[PDB]
Design a protein around this ligand. Sequence first.
Ligand SMILES: [Au+]
Ligand SMILES: [Au+]
Ligand SMILES: [Au+]
Lengths: 150, 147
Amino acid sequence: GSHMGIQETDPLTQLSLPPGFRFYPTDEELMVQYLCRKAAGYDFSLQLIAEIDLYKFDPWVLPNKALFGEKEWYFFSPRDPNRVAGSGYWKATGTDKIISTEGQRVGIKKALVFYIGKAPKGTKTNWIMHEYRLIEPSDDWVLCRIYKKQ
Amino acid sequence: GSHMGIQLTQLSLPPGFRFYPTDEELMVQYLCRKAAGYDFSLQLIAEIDLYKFDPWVLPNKALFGEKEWYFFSPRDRPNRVAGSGYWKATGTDKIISTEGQRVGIKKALVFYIGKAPKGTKTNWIMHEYRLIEPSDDWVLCRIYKKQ
Ligand SMILES: [Au+]
Ligand SMILES: [Au+]
Ligand SMILES: [Au+]
């Protein structure tokens, strides 16, 4: 009959963010305010960053799966070398960083780069992932920042 | 005499959100809206006479900010005195545009301590944004400390 459209929820508009405010979290904030508080069920933590299985997708599709973002995008992905995703694989790079809060260490940040193809014969892309994980024993998520270098 | 007292947190802001406006946003969403007499959900950028203060106490007056601070200051109708020093214009002024139309001018200044022209340079910087006008009267200033 009469038309009834779908009514999406933009999480930034429900926060009433004033113009000019952007999401530029520190590593400590990502660990404590997002990754840790997700486990505790805090509203903003659950509503601002989307859960996805990151390894089902090519990275250039990810910006469209993120709840927001201009040149970087954040996700929670299930916690689990050269892991396959879409048409390629993510390869760990650089030196992992320990993240601390109030003298205590809480998480580890790992950098990865996406290669297109089949390992170890893929070609490097500009797609970068920073994977943040809690230091804890064996729901279970990592928080990932995705961006394109340049 | 029973006691009768005088009465950012109101705002919901989740951790990680920081004020990083583009020049176009400062001109159109802040300075133009204020000049046109529009209301704001909350006042985040307060009015102050910037030239009454040494720049290093300005962070205490700003309603938010960790490393840059923003204010509306009365539009003035070289080396303007403020507190113990003066602000000296530097660099090349920039025209700011929105949708093919020029709307504002950004000017940089640097604070010197002392009496002009014999002061010494500090790391305190101001960016003064003003609306383009014919040849609520405010400028919008960003204050920060270099390094
Ligand atoms: Au936690
Ligand atoms: Au205006
Ligand atoms: Au305002």
